[PDB]
Structure 1
Amino acid sequence: ELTQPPSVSVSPGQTARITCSGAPLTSRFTYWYRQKPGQAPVLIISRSSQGRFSASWSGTTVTLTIRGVQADDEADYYCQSSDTSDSYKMFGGGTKLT
């Protein structure tokens, strides 16, 4: 079970961090999504090769750092990568950014 916060909080102007923890993060790169309630989960984090949105790898965790929280970004965020056997994928929880 991917270990995310289901919600995080931040005030008009500050930065924030969402940590998606677990086991397979020491092996596979991490990809993220933005589902505004009922929308199509927008892809924001990729591995284009071996601006305001990024994610820092750290062992059992990969921390999604968000800079510049306009209220336009209130949504459920989902971390998703792959297990160590490269067969199946699955998603974490769904972090409501307040």
Structure 2
Amino acid sequence: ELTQPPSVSVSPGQTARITCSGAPLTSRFTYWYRQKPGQAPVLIISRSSQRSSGWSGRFSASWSGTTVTLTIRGVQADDEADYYCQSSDTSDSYKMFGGGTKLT
């Protein structure tokens, strides 16, 4: 029963803030992805080591107790679509889905 907001907005050329709240946030990590209308989603951020995965300049991520923080680049121009959020249960069985925010 994870919780991702579905309606937030921000000005272009400014830092934004994407969250996703859920109790099974330990052995799950975080997905997001941005599906432009009628297209296929791509890697929002990808794990290439067990330590961290915010190496690319465009995006970074932070971790809180339950809510997850998807910080983004300074310029928010040209790239806009709804950002979902996905994770896995503690038994490493199941993948929860719970919406995601469309940003304008």
TM-score range, shorter chain: 0.7 to 0.9
CA RMSD in angstroms comes to: 1.5
Structure with the higher fraction of residues in strand conformation:
1
**1:69 positional shift:** 4.0
Per the TM alignment, residue 72 of structure 1 is displaced from its structure 2 partner at its CA by: 2.2
Return the TM-score normalized by structure 2: 0.83
Gap change, CA 1:70 and 1:19, over 3 Å in 2: closer
Per-residue CA deviation, residues 6-39 of structure 1 (Å, 9 max, x unaligned), is 0221112110001100101133211221111221
Contact 2:14/2:75 (8 A) holds in 1:
yes
Query: Hey, what's the Cα distance between the residues in 2 that align with 1:15 and 1:32?
Result: 17
Q: Does structure 2 conserve the Cα–Cα contact (< 8 Å) formed by 1:35 and 1:41?
A: yes
Residue number among 54, 69, 88 corresponding to 2:60 in the alignment:
54
Q: 2: CA distance between counterparts of 1:53 and 1:11?
A: 17
Q: Deviation of residue 68 (structure 1)?
A: 3.3
Secondary structure at 2:45 match in 1: coil
User: TM-score if structure 1 supplies the norm length?
Assistant: 0.87
Moved over 4 A (4+): none
Cα distance per residue 1:34-78 (max 9 Å; x no partner): 111221011121211012112211111111111134442110101
Number of equivalent positions: 98
Identity of aligned residues (%): 100
